[PDB]
């Protein structure tokens, strides 16, 4: 049996107070009747508003990034600061941060390790580029990204880890991976985890797909045996996030 | 006559709800009896708390950074998002971001220009390194940093600009610039502004000093004719920020 699914909303750098209040009310009014962990990741400045307004019992709130330690880091938000304000989920290593904001495999791995030490649930993002896929490097790439993370984790830390496989070429592009494309990668990841970390870890690990997930494509993705839910960007700013949650039934 | 002084608190990546509530109460209870713009710049996630609790009429709230536009920028906070939540001040180009987070003169200049277009007051940070100072490059460096900003601004945008001169070697190091060191640089900056932008602009421009400002050194810095207040890091997390404000009398 699959582990508990996750439906995660990465709002990215988007929102107004008015738009968030409206969307949150839509999410609150959508009554969910199955076991699923829903996650909303707003911008940092919107975390208090979402904390005040989001009441659906299936949801938790996540940050979109963090740094490990407080101190002289003008502009940044640390893991202790998030924990204190009641945020205990974080997305780390998103492709936009790997690509625009310098986050190498080592930097991502270090962040994930620190977040686990500080008691976070972590959605750790991995995925290959278009060029890497064309070169038949997908497996080497995602396994290298995963192994870099793993090397900084104890076995027991994996209870706090969620992997999100997002092919870079599928993020925001109108070009979702097919169910067969996604399942092939999730199967390889779970095999690596089973062999390197443990069979027990692998059976419990949520491996989410992201990159152009929408209400119409989600159910057929979820039907694949190694897909445990979704990391959703554009569609998570819309009412159709309700249908993506329901696609994890 | 000097323009209205500014006393700005850069909290950097620091705070808990409890510590912020206590410090804000200290700031609220300190009754200020002269014309000064006080600024508090908390982390993004703490902006709503500070907005809820800070009531001293001499204060405004600033962000510590921003990006220009909303969109697919996981982890970042944009200028439109800040404006919508009621933050219309931003610190841009702080040394920690120039040094750790890739912000070149061009990137800083572009951010400042965008913030002015969007109606922000901007505290734009400039300053030379230890090595640059030893090489007698201070003036060339700060003028190049200032000119890069200026090249993207219309004359009228300068009503929204505040410069903060922070020698990098003075930030967090226990080694404040002397009043004579700071004044020499502020005099050169104001001369450049007068000659390149206008005499009217130069007379109204606030040029703040930062780098190890504390309650005991602030008044003698403020006594210099071209110093218009302070950008304060470590001491702004402490009750002594009250005395730094009072040093602008």
UniProtKB/Swiss-Prot annotation, chains A, B:
Origin organism of this chain?
Answer: Leishmania mexicana
Quote the subcellular location field of this record: Cytoplasm; Glycosome
NCBIfam families in alphabetical order: tim (TIGR00419)
What is the name listed in the Swiss-Prot or TrEMBL entry for this protein?
A: Triosephosphate isomerase
Question: To which protein family does this belong?
Answer: Belongs to the triosephosphate isomerase family.
Report the PROSITE patterns cross-referenced here.
TIM_1 (PS00171), TIM_2 (PS51440)
**InterPro entries in UniProt:** Aldolase_TIM (IPR013785), TIM_sf (IPR035990), TrioseP_Isoase_bac/euk (IPR022896), Triosephosphate_isomerase (IPR000652), Triosephosphate_isomerase_AS (IPR020861)
- A Gene Ontology cellular-component term: glycosome
Q: What catalytic activity does the UniProt entry give for this protein?
A: D-glyceraldehyde 3-phosphate = dihydroxyacetone phosphate
Write out the pathway annotation from the protein's UniProt entry. Carbohydrate biosynthesis; gluconeogenesis; Carbohydrate degradation; glycolysis; D-glyceraldehyde 3-phosphate from glycerone phosphate: step 1/1
How is this protein organized at the quaternary level?
A: Homodimer.
Positions annotated to bind substrate: 10, 12
Q: Which GO terms describe its biological process?
A: gluconeogenesis; glyceraldehyde-3-phosphate biosynthetic process; glycerol catabolic process; glycolytic process
* Enzyme Commission number(s) from the entry: 5.3.1.1
What PANTHER family does the annotation carry? Answer: TRIOSEPHOSPHATE ISOMERASE
- Keywords of this entry: Cytoplasm, Gluconeogenesis, Glycolysis, Glycosome, Isomerase, Peroxisome
Residue ranges spanning the membrane: these are none
Name the cystine pairs: none
């Amino acid at each position: 049996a699959k582990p508990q699914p996750i439906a995660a909303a990465n709002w990215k750098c988007n929102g107004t107070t008015a738009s968030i209040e409206k969307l949150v009310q839509v999410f609150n009014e959508h009554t969910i009747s199955h076991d699923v962990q829903c996650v909303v990741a707003p911008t940092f400045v919107h975390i208090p508003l979402v904390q005040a307004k989001l009441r659906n019992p299936k949801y938790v709130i996540s940050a979109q990034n963090a740094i490990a330690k407080s101190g002289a880091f003008t502009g940044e938000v640390s893991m202790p600061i998030l924990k204190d304000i009641g945020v205990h989920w974080v997305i780390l290593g998103h492709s936009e941060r790997r690509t625009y904001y310098g986050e190498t495999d080592e930097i991502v791995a270090q962040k994930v390790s620190e977040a686990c030490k500080q008691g976070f649930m972590v959605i750790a993002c991995i995925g290959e580029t278009l060029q890497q896929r064309e070169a038949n490097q997908t497996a080497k790439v995602v396994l290298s990204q995963t192994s870099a993370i793993a090397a900084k984790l104890t076995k027991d830390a994996w209870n706090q880890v969620v992997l999100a496989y997002e092919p870079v070429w599928a993020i925001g592009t109108g070009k979702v991976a097919t169910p067969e494309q996604a399942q092939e990668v999730h199967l390889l990841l779970r095999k690596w985890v089973s062999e390197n970390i443990g069979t027990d870890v692998a059976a419990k690990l949520r491996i989410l797909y992201g990159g152009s997930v929408n209400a119409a494509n989600a159910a057929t993705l979820y039907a694949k045996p190694d897909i445990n839910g979704f990391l959703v960007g554009g569609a998570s700013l819309k009412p159709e996030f309700r249908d993506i949650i329901d696609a994890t039934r």
